[PDB]
Write a protein that binds this ligand. Structure first.
Ligand code: 71B
Lengths: 249, 1059
């Protein structure tokens, strides 16, 4: 009973069992010339158990499952609420629990690639998007310089029509208007270049949302697929066979 | 079909279905010479907008200079109308919109059309606008940085502008040290002495000296240049450069027409005119250290070499130094307030709405905002809000109530929030804010927070280690919110106020009475404690950072806090035992830390990780560095100190001012300070911060800016070239690819850009002309470039006629970078503590997003090659002996005996490091042996056992010694396992393992400081916990040894005895 004790396992692998449990979840651990047992309550708060009384290790913990730890030490207004082999299809097979550990671990490892793929697509897309955004400010700036140019030429060219005029009246002004015509339909091209970027930007940001959307639907399954796979590996280690595991995994 | 039970997979298809098949090289993308095209066409048309308003397009060659183009433009503008409206071409300058969307005026008209980063191929002509042409060489700065400087000027944030103006304090203060004893101290900034930490010498180095003497060689030149004269000395190891310079002159100028005394007077006039160079690279011996203390000497001893120094005239040196010439830039708490300790209310925070949330309604049921206050760890019960308006348009208009009084908020307090899905608990996004601003002002009013996506390794809900601040990227969940406004901007208490409230809190404790259960808080011991406690406190002190402290031990520590001053090294543990949610305690802690005893830098660096965010603490930590941390020991740990900047709350802080100043005092620091900052500029967590800091550096670093601008330009050339090779020239033969490479590199823009410049791996080494015949693309799928340069030194011959270094686009170098750093630190730890294991921590430098440089080690081969070249006729099996046979073929005589010693010394070092760090499994193609017999590992992959993230108490052995290695270790004997040759080898490994076990605090902290960098292998502290098991820190060393012996026995299957 004191060796079994449910929560009594008997540092690093304690954290991974306390990882992602709620506020109040706990367990008890075992240098002996230091202290004896260690209550690891998550809020990870470590509380010593000295033995010289502790009447027993099980005696002290059942009291504080009912009652908080505030009266003992000021800033611990939290109880030992969650004292964490339940499901696992109850398979008392040993071999077939071992096969399921491969099955779920192939599914988990399959799922982690899909998650890793999409986190790259996401960040490439966040890059590709903002590259387009800057390009649009570049186009828009490019266009100002061309819009300024067709303006800049009108000031000087329509001075050089009126003054003189008769001196090559079309011989001059044809080849001034030709340049002006090339200038403005060039602007027409630049603008239609820019417009066409912005249509892609929304089509990119569309895909960007669709990546994130499926990341958030791959995540919750990935957490429980991992969590089920860990209890399937707990259930086994409750024959030792530390070395046999690796072929399944 | 009976293989598969006829069970089809309908979904599967192979009409191009992934980057599994031919699976390598994912860094993309980044655009090159023009918008949307990597490499501009060799003959291109460019619009030339004139002042008269005329557009003339003229075909230019891609590589044509602006002087060439202007000169032709004003010939071709004659044939267009309104020619009389143009001035002379000299009254004009080019400008255009660049790829960064700014309109860069092109002042340096020697630049080529391809090198301009033009976006659209067009140029506009204008008369030079700003009267200070000089002032608008922030292009230099913004080219070095990679974002244009003007981009800061239109930032609104008062902090950023306050950083930019205030940090100049440091820049001016640095330059003022440089031009103090010029030209000497300038030469000292440029060519700082490359020197070990210790003058004291290891016994194994000393024993190569025959009673403290080396044979040196001094070289000199006379007429015209090019004829050189040896002057081989035999000086004391611990004599200074000046003394070595005299001897060379003595022996140069002894003569049969010179009396003894006549020589002595010729020595004095000559002696002060020279200083010692290293032949073959820009290194020098510029101050009084023992020769042995300079790195070059100490390496020359180890490799069994005769140092080759040059006698260099000080004026031929002070020739080559320029004027650093600093220039202040264009850019040259208002009213009273209500102290935080006056505010008589709890904390509450109004969570309004998140907008841009992308979730499946079919998958997820309900979503909510989790929140919490933090200090690294949390000052209260973590609360949520209710699960209201699920998935579709989520809008809660709730005040969250946190059980903490506003006065008990610490200066370094931070709200860490996250939107989650529902036990289906699962984070969507996250983001944190500092509860105070950089001017100490408690944050009130309305705030909008653009969030960050959850990274790979995080299963947790909240992520408080993550960066404080909003996301720059707009298209992300913008969770906006409101903070309680108290009819006055609430500021944080002064230190003078905290001192008084502390000094009161003390005297108030002095009258608390007889019995106090939960003594924990206060001592009840008086001036006399018990000896058993004072023994227990040093036991706590010794325990590493990751051995978490109990609530008992915490309180025990916090009570005896005043005795804890006698054991300074406890401070990290003490600080973690403060109740930061009790200002009474925190006020008292500020008084201890104010005048706490300085501690050693390797212990004070713990205080700059994410578990110690308080300004007062981090101050003390930088105070520790300013005292002890030498310029040598700084650059050892520079990677860790740049990463630790991320955990500072504000731009403007004591650490940034420390590092910045050092970088401007020492150009070897500056050089790597630039490149680690520049490396991370792609990462939007820090783009803003590091740009600002890189501006500060670039503006104050003197002429090295112009050197860095060449290095930068040379890397960008290579980044394109490889990016072309990895996209369009994939699915080609090497033959075809290499024909493309050599074509490109011969063009003049490549010939200009890749030739005369400094290696970023070590700016001592110059890179001269490219030797293209020895330049080539490697066989790797990533298309790395094997690049080769002529060492243009005077004494190329004496050091290496060819420098050569690998450039690898598409592979994240910073994991390798760190392990190679850890190896370099393990080596120094062993060797400086007298035991000569020989690691080869080759050079590696990441310069960007999965782009970097790797030192070539000449004359070394993969075990695989050793076996390929030694494979006999018909392809049956490879011989175990061929390594041994190949090593003998290179080392014959007494040389053989020494080669095995080296092999066995390098095999023992690399076994222990590898096992401890848990680096990727070792095998034939990632292990390398050199002609002289030293072995070393390459391509480390994942350091702290990142493949345990699938399944994982594996405590793996990555270097497993096949027979091949043991044959070589024990000369040739059958059953190698049982010789004295191997007994030795084992005892090297045990002594090595115990050395790294007694320096475990350091290595923990190095990894702790690297959490900042988003390395998937370092996501949070229990990643770093692997190094505890592998070192066995919870056990006693006698068990630890046996643990290692055990761990080693089972991997090798027999051979590891009691001893
Ligand atoms: C000073 O030499 C130069 C080196 C590189 C570039 N881009 C321009 C230069 F004038």
């Amino acid at each position: 009973s004191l060796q079994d004790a449910e929560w009594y396992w008997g540092r690093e692998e304690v954290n991974e069992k306390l990882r992602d449990t709620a506020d109040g979840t706990f367990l008890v651990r075992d240098t002996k010339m230091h202290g004896d047992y260690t209550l690891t309550l998550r809020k990870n708060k470590l509380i010593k158990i000295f033995h010289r009384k502790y009447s027993s290790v099980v005696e002290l913990i059942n009291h504080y499952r009912n009652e908080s730890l505030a009266q003992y030490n000021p800033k611990l207004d939290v109880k030992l609420l969650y004292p964490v082999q339940d499901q696992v299809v109850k398979e008392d097979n040993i071999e077939a629990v071992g096969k399921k550990l491969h099955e779920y671990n192939t599914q988990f490892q399959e799922k982690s690639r899909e998650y890793d793929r999409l986190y790259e697509e996401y960040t490439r897309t966040s890059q590709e998007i903002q590259m387009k955004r800057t390009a649009i400010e570049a186009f828009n700036e490019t266009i100002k310089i061309f819009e300024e140019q067709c303006q800049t030429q009108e000031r000087y060219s329509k001075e050089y029509i009126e003054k003189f005029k008769r001196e090559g009246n079309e011989k001059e002004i044809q080849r001034i208007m030709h340049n002006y015509d090339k200038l403005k339909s060039r602007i027409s091209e630049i603008i239609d270049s820019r417009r066409r970027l912005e249509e892609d930007l929304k089509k990119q940001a569309a895909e960007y949302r669709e990546i994130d959307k499926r990341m958030n639907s791959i995540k919750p399954d990935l957490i429980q697929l991992r969590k089920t796979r860990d209890q399937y590996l707990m259930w086994l280690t409750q024959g030792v066979r530390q070395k046999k595991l690796n072929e399944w995994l | 079909m009976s293989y598969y039970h006829h069970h089809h997979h309908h979904d599967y298809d192979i009409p191009t279905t992934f980057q599994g098949a031919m699976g390598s090289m994912p860094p993309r993308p980044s655009s090159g010479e023009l918008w949307g095209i990597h490499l501009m066409p060799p003959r291109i048309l460019v619009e030339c907008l004139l002042p008269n308003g005329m557009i003339v397009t003229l075909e230019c060659l891609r590589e044509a200079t602006l002087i060439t183009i202007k000169h032709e433009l004003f010939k071709e503008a004659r044939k267009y109308p309104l020619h009389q409206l143009l001035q002379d071409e000299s009254s004009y300058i080019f400008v255009s919109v660049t790829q960064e969307a700014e309109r860069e005026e092109f002042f340096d008209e020697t630049r080529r059309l391809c090198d301009l980063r033009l976006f659209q191929p067009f140029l506009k002509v204008i008369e030079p606008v700003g009267n200070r042409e000089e002032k608008i060489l922030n292009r230099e700065i913004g080219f070095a940085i990679g974002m244009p400087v003007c981009e800061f000027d239109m930032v609104k944030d008062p902090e950023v502008q306050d950083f930019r103006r205030n940090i100049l304090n440091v820049c001016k203060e640095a330059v003022d040290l440089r031009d103090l004893n010029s030209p000497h101290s300038r030469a000292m900034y440029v060519y700082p002495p490359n020197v070990e930490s210790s003058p004291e010498l290891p016994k194994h180095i000393y024993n190569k000296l025959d009673k403290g003497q080396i044979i040196v060689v001094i070289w000199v030149i006379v007429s015209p240049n090019n004829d050189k004269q040896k002057y081989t000395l035999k000086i004391n190891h611990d004599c200074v450069p000046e003394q070595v310079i005299a001897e060379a002159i003595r022996k140069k100028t002894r003569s049969m027409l010179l009396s003894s005394e006549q020589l002595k007077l010729c020595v004095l006039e000559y002696q002060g005119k020279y200083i010692l160079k290293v032949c073959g690279c820009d290194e020098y011996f510029l101050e009084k250290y023992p020769l042995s203390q300079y790195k070059y000497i100490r390496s020359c001893i180890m490799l069994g070499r005769m140092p080759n120094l040059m006698l260099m005239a000080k004026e031929s040196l002070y020739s080559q130094l320029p004027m650093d010439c600093f220039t202040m830039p264009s850019y040259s708490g208002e009213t009273s307030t209500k102290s935080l300790w006056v505010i008589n209310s709890a904390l509450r925070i109004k969570i309004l709405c998140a907008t841009y949330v992308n979730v499946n309604i079919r998958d997820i049921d309900k979503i909510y905002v989790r929140t919490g206050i933090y200090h690294g760890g949390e000052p209260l019960c973590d609360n949520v809000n209710t699960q209201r308006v699920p998935c579709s348009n989520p809008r809660w208009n709730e005040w969250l109530n946190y059980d903490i009084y506003i006065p008990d908020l610490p200066r370094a307090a931070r709200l860490c929030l996250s939107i989650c899905s529902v036990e289906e608990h699962c984070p969507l996004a996250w983001g944190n804010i500092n509860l105070f601003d950089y001017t100490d002002t408690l944050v009130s009013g309305k705030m909008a927070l653009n969030l960050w996506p959850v990274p790979h390794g995080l299963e947790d809900l909240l992520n408080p280690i993550g960066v404080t601040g909003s996301n720059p990227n707009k298209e992300t969940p913008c969770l906006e919110l409101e903070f309680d406004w108290f009819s006055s901007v609430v500021k944080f208490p002064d230190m003078s106020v905290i001192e008084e409230h502390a000094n009161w809190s003390v005297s108030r404790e002095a009258g608390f009475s007889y019995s106090h259960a939960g003594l924990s808080n206060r001592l009840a011991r008086d001036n006399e404690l018990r000896e058993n406690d004072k023994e227990q406190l040093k036991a706590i002190s010794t325990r590493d950072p990751l051995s978490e402290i109990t609530e008992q031990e915490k309180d025990f520590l916090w009570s005896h806090r005043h005795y804890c001053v006698t054991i300074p090294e406890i401070l990290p543990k003490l600080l973690l035992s403060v109740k930061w949610n009790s200002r009474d305690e925190v006020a008292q802690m500020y008084c201890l830390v104010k005048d706490w005893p300085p501690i050693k830098p390797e212990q004070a660096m713990e205080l700059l990780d994410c578990n110690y965010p308080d300004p007062m603490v981090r101050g003390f930590a930088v105070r520790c560095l300013e005292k002890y941390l030498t310029d040598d020991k700084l650059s050892q740990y520079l990677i860790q100190l740049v990463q630790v900047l991320k955990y500072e709350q504000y731009l403007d802080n004591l650490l940034v001012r420390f590092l910045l100043k050092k970088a401007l005092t020492n150009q070897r620091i500056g050089h790597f300070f630039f490149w680690h900052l520049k490396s991370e500029m792609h990462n939007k967590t820090v783009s803003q911060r590091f740009g600002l800091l890189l501006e500060s550096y670039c503006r104050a670093c003197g002429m090295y800016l112009k050197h860095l601008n060449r290095q930068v330009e040379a890397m960008e050339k290579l980044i394109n070239l490889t990016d072309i090779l990895k996209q369009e020239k994939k699915d080609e033969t090497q033959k075809v690819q290499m024909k493309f490479l050599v074509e490109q590199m011969r063009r003049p823009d490549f010939m200009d850009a890749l030739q005369g410049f400094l290696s970023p791996l070590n700016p001592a080494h110059q890179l001269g002309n490219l030797r293209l015949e020895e330049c080539r693309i490697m066989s790797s799928a990533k298309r790395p470039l094997w690049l080769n340069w002529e060492n243009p030194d005077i004494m190329s011959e004496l050091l290496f006629q060819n420098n050569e270094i690998i450039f690898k686009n598409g592979d994240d170098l910073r994991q390798d970078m760190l392990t190679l750093q850890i190896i370099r630190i393990m080596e120094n730890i062993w060797q400086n503590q007298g035991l000569d294991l020989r690691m080869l921590p080759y050079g590696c430098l990441s310069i960007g997003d999965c782009v970097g440089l790797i030192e070539v080690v000449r004359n070394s081969h993969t075990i695989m090659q050793i076996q390929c070249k030694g494979g006999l006729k018909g392809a049956l099996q490879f011989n175990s002996h061929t390594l041994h046979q190949w090593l003998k073929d290179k080392n014959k005589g007494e040389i053989y005996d020494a080669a095995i010693d080296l092999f066995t010394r390098s095999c023992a070092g690399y076994c222990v490091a590898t096992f401890i760090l848990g680096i990727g499994d070792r095998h034939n193609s990632n292990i390398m042996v050199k002609d002289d017999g030293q072995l070393f590992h390459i391509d480390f992959g994942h350091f702290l056992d990142h493949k345990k993230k699938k399944f994982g108490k594996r405590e793996r052995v990555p270097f497993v010694l096949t027979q091949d290695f043991l044959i070589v270790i024990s000369k040739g004997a059958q059953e190698c396992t049982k010789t004295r040759e191997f007994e030795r080898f084992q005892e090297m490994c045990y002594k090595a393992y115990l050395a790294i076990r007694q320096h475990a605090n350091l290595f923990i902290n190095l990894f702790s400081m690297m959490l900042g960098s988003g390395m998937p292998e370092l996501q949070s502290f229990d990643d770093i916990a692997y190094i505890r098991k592998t070192l066995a820190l919870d056990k006693t060393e006698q068990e630890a040894l046996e643990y290692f012996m055990k761990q080693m026995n089972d991997a090798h299957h027999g051979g590891w005895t009691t001893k």
